[PDB]
């Protein structure tokens, strides 16, 4: 369904004008919507945690992969709606959010790479999917190359990801040299006990986790997120993280790892404290993503963590999309635009937003409280599942670090709300232009999901218990 979309897009975009980009992106938006709503019945293949191997043991298929797959389509639909649909029908918003001719094709190829990462069963398939995603994401980062701020980020991301992919390939080839194999099916309890292949898996996890940017290799991706266009940043900071973390969770190669635990604690501390030292919105959200990545990395130290990870990644994806879309909507209520690519930079520019759109500030307050973990929002429940999982395995110091990190992060989360509920006497230079109904509906749906998804907690728990056991 994705390969056919990619081929059809190359063919159709080849023979189309530049003005047809919005229409093509809308067409793919409804195409993916129909793919989800019409082919969703494939979840019947995974009753009682039934697992399949596809393409000569090169791919794995179970309920976990299916759910991550559907979540990636939902995120792709939201992000592509952000490109096809025009927020405001005026020339300025025309200029800021204008998709490139190849952006949708690169987006779909990156989705394909992420899915192949999630579904990988062999190191050859894993490396090929990693390279596909990496090259696609480099091209996504570089496709807006009319600024040196974006150009330096593109070049840095290319080089750092090249080093990381080389390290991943080196680890995979060391594993092959040790075992003369390219799959995890040759690893059993006896295999792990008899031979010391732990360091190979530690190196592989290191290379994979550095691609999403855990400490002490966080600064480069934070700079990249700061400097890329915000409609690009919303995508490049979610999908690769989801793919890498899902592959790491399903691989289950870091049980009670000291190195992984220490790096997770370092990631949490760096994300929490460094967020306090931020005056830019993009850097603040980058450190927020770092803290969430540390939270999810804490789940890599124990088994039977599928439910907690799935719940947390879904709620975090929804909250991430919601917060970036709130930041996008707030662009209309500022008197000047920083760059063509990043129109808002500093948190101080959101000052007094409650006097321009009080319900936008209400939605932002809901999403920020969910980030902090205020009940009964989804973020609190995800953090609670993480706490239950870590206390079931006896990680008490990890739990204390988690609680302290959340308390520290609450300060710079409430920084946003405190700035936004201030008073701005400077009235707007713009008035009464109507915001897009489709994008507003999507943002409101995300906010309502965050607010009232705790209704279906028992239903989701039962579905997990029947479809994952």
């Amino acid at each position: 369904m994705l390969i056919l979309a990619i081929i059809s897009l190359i063919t159709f975009v080849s023979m189309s004008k530049l003005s047809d980009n919005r229409a093509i992106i809308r067409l793919i938006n409804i195409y993916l919507i129909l793919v989800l709503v019409l082919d969703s019945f494939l979840y019947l293949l995974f009753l009682n945690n039934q697992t399949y191997t596809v393409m000569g043991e090169l791919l794995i298929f179970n309920s976990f992969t299916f759910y991550i797959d559907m979540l990636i389509y939902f995120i792709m639909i939201v992000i592509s709606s952000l490109y096809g649909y025009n927020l405001y029908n005026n020339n300025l918003y025309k200029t800021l959010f204008e998709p490139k001719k190849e952006l949708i094709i690169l987006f779909l190829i990156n989705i394909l790479g992420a899915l192949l990462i999630v579904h990988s069963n062999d190191f050859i398939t894993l490396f090929v999917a990693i390279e596909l995603q990496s090259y696609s994401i480099y091209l996504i980062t570089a496709i807006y190359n009319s600024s040196y701020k974006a150009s330096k980020a593109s070049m840095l991301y290319f080089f750092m990801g090249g080093i990381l992919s080389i390290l991943i390939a080196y680890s995979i080839n060391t594993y092959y040299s040790v075992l003369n194999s390219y799959t995890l099916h040759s690893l059993d309890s006896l295999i792990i006990n008899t031979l010391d292949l732990n360091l190979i898996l530690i190196a592989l996890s290191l290379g994979l986790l550095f691609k999403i940017g855990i400490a002490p290799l966080h600064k480069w991706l934070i700079s990249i997120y700061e400097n890329t266009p915000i409609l690009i940043t919303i995508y490049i900071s979610l999908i690769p993280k989801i793919s890498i973390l899902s592959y790491l969770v399903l691989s289950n190669i870091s049980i009670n790892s000291l190195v992984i635990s220490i790096l997770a604690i370092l990631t949490l501390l760096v994300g929490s404290v460094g967020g306090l030292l931020q005056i830019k919105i993009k850097r603040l959200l980058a450190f927020s993503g770092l803290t969430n990545a540390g939270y999810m990395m804490l789940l890599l130290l124990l088994n039977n963590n599928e439910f907690s990870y799935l719940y947390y990644i879904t709620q975090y994806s929804i909250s991430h999309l919601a917060i970036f879309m709130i930041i996008i909507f707030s662009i209309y209520y500022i008197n000047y635009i920083n760059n063509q690519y990043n129109p808002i930079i500093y948190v101080n520019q959101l000052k007094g937003l409650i006097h321009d759109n009080a319900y936008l500030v209400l939605s932002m307050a809901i999403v920020v409280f969910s980030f902090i973990g205020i009940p009964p929002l989804l973020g609190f429940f995800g953090k609670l599942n993480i706490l239950m999982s870590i206390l079931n395995n006896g990680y008490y110091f990890i739990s204390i670090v988690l609680i302290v990190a959340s308390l520290i992060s609450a300060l710079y989360y409430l920084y946003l709300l405190n700035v936004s509920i201030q008073d701005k006497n400077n009235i707007l230079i713009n008035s009464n232009e109507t915001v897009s109904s489709v994008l507003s509906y999507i943002l409101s749906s995300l906010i309502i999901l965050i607010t009232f998804g705790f209704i279906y907690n028992s239903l989701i728990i039962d579905i997990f218990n029947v479809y994952f056991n």
């Binding site: 759109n357 109507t434 915001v435 109904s437 409101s444 749906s445 906010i447 279906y456 579905i463």
Partner: protein
């Protein structure tokens, strides 16, 4: 109950429509036909999820 689940889903759709209207700086009763559309769509999603839940319980009970 199925009726209660449908009512809750429709109410969530109405809340989403109301929030969308208020975000756009528009009156609460702006496009009531949009309220109907949103309620119908969210009620349908709730019905699908309730059917999935019922099938899940059936599968849980059948292996006994």
């Amino acid at each position: 109950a199925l009726f209660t689940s449908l009512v809750g889903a429709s109410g969530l759709g109405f809340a989403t429509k109301f929030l969308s209207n208020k975000i756009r700086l528009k009156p609460a009763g702006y496009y009531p036909l949009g309220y109907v559309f949103s309620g119908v769509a969210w009620a349908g999603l709730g019905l699908v999820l309730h059917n999935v839940h019922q099938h899940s319980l059936e599968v849980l009970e059948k292996k006994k």
